[PDB]
Amino acid sequence: TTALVCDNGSGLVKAGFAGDDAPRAVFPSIVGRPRHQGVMVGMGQKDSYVGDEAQSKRGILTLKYPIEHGIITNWDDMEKIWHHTFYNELRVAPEEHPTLLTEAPLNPKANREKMTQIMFETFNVPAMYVAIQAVLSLYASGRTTGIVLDSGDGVTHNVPIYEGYALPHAIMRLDLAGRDLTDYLMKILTERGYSFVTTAEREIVRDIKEKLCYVALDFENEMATAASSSSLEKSYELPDGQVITIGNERFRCPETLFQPSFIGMESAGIHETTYNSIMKCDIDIRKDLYANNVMSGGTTMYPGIADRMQKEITALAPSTMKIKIIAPPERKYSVWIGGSILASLSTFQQMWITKQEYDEAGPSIVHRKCF
Amino acid sequence: TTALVCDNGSGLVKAGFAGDDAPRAVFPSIVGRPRHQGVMVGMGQKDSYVGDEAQSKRGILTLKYPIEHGIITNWDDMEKIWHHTFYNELRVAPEEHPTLLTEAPLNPKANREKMTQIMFETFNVPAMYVAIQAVLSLYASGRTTGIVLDSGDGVTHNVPIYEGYALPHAIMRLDLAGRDLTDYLMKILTERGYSFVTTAEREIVRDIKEKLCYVALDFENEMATAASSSSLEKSYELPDGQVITIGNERFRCPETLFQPSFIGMESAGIHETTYNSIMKCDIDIRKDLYANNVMSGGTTMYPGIADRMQKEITALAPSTMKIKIIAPPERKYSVWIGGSILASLSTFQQMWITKQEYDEAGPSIVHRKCF
Amino acid sequence: LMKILTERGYSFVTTAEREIVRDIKEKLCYVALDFENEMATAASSSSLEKSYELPDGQVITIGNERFRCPETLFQPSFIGMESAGIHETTYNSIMKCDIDIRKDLYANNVMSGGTTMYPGIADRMQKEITALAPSTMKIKIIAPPERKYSVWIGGSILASLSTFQQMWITKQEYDEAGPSIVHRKCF
Amino acid sequence: SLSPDPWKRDAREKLEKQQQMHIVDMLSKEIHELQNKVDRTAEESDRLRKLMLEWQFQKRLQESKQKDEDD
Amino acid sequence: SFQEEKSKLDAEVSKWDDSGNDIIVLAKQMCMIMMEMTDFTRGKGPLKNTSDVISAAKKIAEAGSRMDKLGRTIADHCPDSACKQDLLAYLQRIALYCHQLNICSKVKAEVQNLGGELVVSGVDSAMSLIQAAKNLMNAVVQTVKASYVASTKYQKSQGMASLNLPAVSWKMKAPEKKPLVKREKQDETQTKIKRASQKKHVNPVQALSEFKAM
Ligand SMILES: Nc1ncnc2c1ncn2[C@@H]1O[C@H](COP(=O)(O)OP(=O)(O)O)[C@@H](O)[C@H]1O
Ligand SMILES: Nc1ncnc2c1ncn2[C@@H]1O[C@H](COP(=O)(O)OP(=O)(O)O)[C@@H](O)[C@H]1O
Ligand SMILES: [Mg+2]
Ligand SMILES: [Mg+2]
């Protein structure tokens, strides 16, 4: 019986069977409930929509996110999503498949303890295991050394790995991801008179960001050219037939990843924070860590982000060093792909957290075994 | 057994049995009393005529409407009409037939509380229920998503509904209907030398409107063709044999629906009242509301009213989207048909207002349940 | 207020009558300290009824609508809006600041504008804010009597300052730079 | 089946109308049979009397109803 | 492998004549009727005029009542849980849509007799019944999947005995693998206004085609 590889991030839930090369369920991680008054008889018995059906009824629903900043905050809703991805999206029996869960580094200790307790007690999974976002990304790249920059929807973190060995002291975590960029774009658009205030409208701004935003190779030059001409303008059509225009906001929303002071944060940019982590490593392994730079996650999908990323690192590192950046076209699903490889490994079949171990040790077994 | 379905409006009264496909009693909602000296002995005992029999003796009566602008103003005459339709029209005993009533939205609360009190105390029905007229129009249309434009004899209102959920904040009610068009026609007709001042003569003018009036696609262009030629003239024969002629007044009377300033009202036309109601809804459901635009009521029976509405909406809405108008041939009885569907429904048989609940709560029970 | 006034049978539809409703609101409306208690007391007795006289001489009576209209500030769902009330918005803003200044921001809560002149809004805001903040902190609300003209009073103070004459927008500055000068200088 | 449906009521009305339209033919046949018997009995006069009365009223009703389909 | 394929057809065709005792076979009968009236708008199906659509309205509505009976039996034997609550939610919608089809079709029938076919000469009166038909089918697809989940989840549970559960006569297909990347095309260059992606609505034929007999 094949294992289950579930990658439940802040924004989307990816699930599938171990050994495959693609997930089978990719739906938003939202739960919506009606906020209006039901008049037609028999149409109001349903009181909770999960996933794709919730997104198709944004007009009469309020959308909540069970996960924010990679930390689960609502547990009743999270159980609903897990039940939805086993019986509806995958249509399998949870009680006869070991399940592989994933978690981000430097999360609260009690977070994964509650994740394991729910899996064994409720879904009766025979076994389970918890992995790390950045570690699984290396498998998808087919390398054993390098530094991983995973930028998702709730958290951005770096993990340097050399010859299959980790350096926990050099791991950096930054709570600035795609969700923060959506809020900034929502506020910036008010300069032209466009206002979105509802939770349903926030999903419209997310669609605009993924279709019109890009990273500028040089920020100052683009600002000078933006005001002089109108060659950087683009138009987007709202669902109600209205058309909006965007000028310099196209390259301003993704640019705050390098200047977090725009949103008010004191943390350094992504280019600087990965440079600090490299110099926190030993001097012998820095020679190759400059190369083998792996980027993963949906936030790393902006056009020209790699070109800007390489230029900034070059200006910091000595001129003798060679700087390379790896950006696969499939990097949105890199975390899940590495999960399938690990779950189907021949030598990995001996550290699944079996149910018998859980009974004699309680939920605290994950800390001493799972990494 | 069978549950009565009575739809009492400003002009007409509709009643019948739930589960059927057509009403069994349609008579005018007027009560007349004699106004002349009686000289023949024994012929003056009758002092009040109700319904059709009052309409046949207009020459010696003063007709009055117990309901105006959708609000019951004479509770003594209203009980006369309710007794007429239960014994002389349907030939049923109210003691064993729950009844369903209708009432327009944004109506005073005291209207339905006193309506319920009469039903339970006077006629002694086992159960009852009060619904919204605009909601019942969607039941008869075989739909669950759309905006209903209901225009009867006293009130015109708009109610948007999406997936069986109402949006109370987007409901617009305008007190302008057929009875106001009849009064304007009498004033307009005086230009040609015809005078109708008696209440009995208002029924003559009402019949003239229903047989000769129409809505012009373009008012300004039609006025030009009215003066140049005499091809728009038609003649009507009065009961006493006199013949009248109508010129441009045929399309001037129904024009006040789109130009309420003719009567002196400051409000906007019915075309941009619906557009304002749509624009007050959420941006995501506006696509399904521009289509599925349902029209109901006898005032919407003028020739060309559906085509005129579509032209006016299309000029206001964005050109990318499509606007549809639904005008069923039987739209004069849409409100009653929806009531028959709701009353006979299996899932509805648990939300009647039983007489037991009225005992422990009084007339106020209707607000918490009927809505 | 115009929408919920039709429940009693009074209808105002024209723009001229919208000014009549505004005058009624400014004289008869107030903020309820506890919304649920006021609802129960309104149904139990008619001690909250007040009368108003229209220009034509008619007299209308208003019951529980006096405190329902200002309640939509704290419960925007009444008018169909989704965002949180003013009591919660002013608390979300505080949490978005750094922790070192939150103590001083919890105090010195200043109100302004005519909308904040409802009788009891100062007390209601304090009750709701304290229920969200930790019990250790203290909450103070400043409600000057002249807060309807607070915005203008500050403006006269700034323009008359002796160190402000160097940041005006001279006409010759606008002549060569155009209307875009207002963005970088004025704030 | 789940809820009362108008088709069953329509069928019931049609069956009732057909029964009413055949009972008059049965009545006419009974009148013809009792009329043409040369022999007479005491317990037959009242029956035959009520029968012509009912048939004559039914024929009058039919004649009045027929004209309503014209102008 | 030629002989092997014949066994699958025999097992599959063996359930097409179950006399409507199973839930899945009833839903398949439902969908075929709806496609006929859906294709009536294009005028390329067995139906030819409005009167054909009205006759089809009764057949799909009458089959709705039997679907309600079949679904409710499973819900009663199922212990209270999330799956049971979801199952009963759609059964409320089936009663409303089925009742609407019965009354509305009767109204369209009487109007045909009174004013003639020229009143309903336009196809506009036809989509009133067609709209309610596809509304009913969406609820029928949902209640089939909900009924299946409760059957498989509580197959061993007491009270499910002597019942025709889908868990013992049907199997689910594994969902298709998602594409790793959306392939770009050259048509987006011509369009100067970037629009939102149209939502993909599931087709009832495809939603029911994933069922396979044991
Ligand atoms: N083409 C794109 N350009 C920019 N941002 C994107 C694009 N596609 C997705 N995103 C953003 O990246 C996020 C993707 O989330 P994902 O990569 O699945 O990680 P997680 O599962 O942790 O949310 C989304 O929140 C979205 O806002
Ligand atoms: N064919 C028609 N053309 C124009 N106006 C009509 C027509 N039929 C009815 N009306 C007007 O519309 C009104 C219809 O009343 P109706 O909708 O049946 O109930 P209510 O009394 O609730 O409005 C009548 O008062 C009549 O004046
Ligand atoms: Mg992720
Ligand atoms: Mg009406």
Numbering used by the authors:
A (entry chain A), B (entry chain B): 5 to 375
C (entry chain D): 189 to 375
D (entry chain G): 1508 to 1578
E (entry chain H): 690 to 903
Paper quotes:
The central component of this network is the heterotrimeric cadherin-catenin complex consisting of E-cadherin, β-catenin, and αE-catenin. Mechanical regulation is focused on αE-catenin, whose C-terminal actin-binding domain (ABD) and central M domain undergo structural transitions associated with binding-partner engagement that can be modulated by force. Recently, afadin’s short C-terminal coiled-coil region (residues 1393–1602, hereafter referred to as “afadin-CC”), which is required in canoe for morphogenesis, has been reported to enhance F-actin binding by the cadherin-catenin complex through an unknown mechanism, providing an alternative explanation for afadin’s stabilizing effect. Here, we show that vinculin and afadin collaborate to promote a highly activated form of the cadherin-catenin complex, with afadin-CC physically engaging mechanically-regulated structural elements in αE-catenin to mediate cooperative F-actin binding.
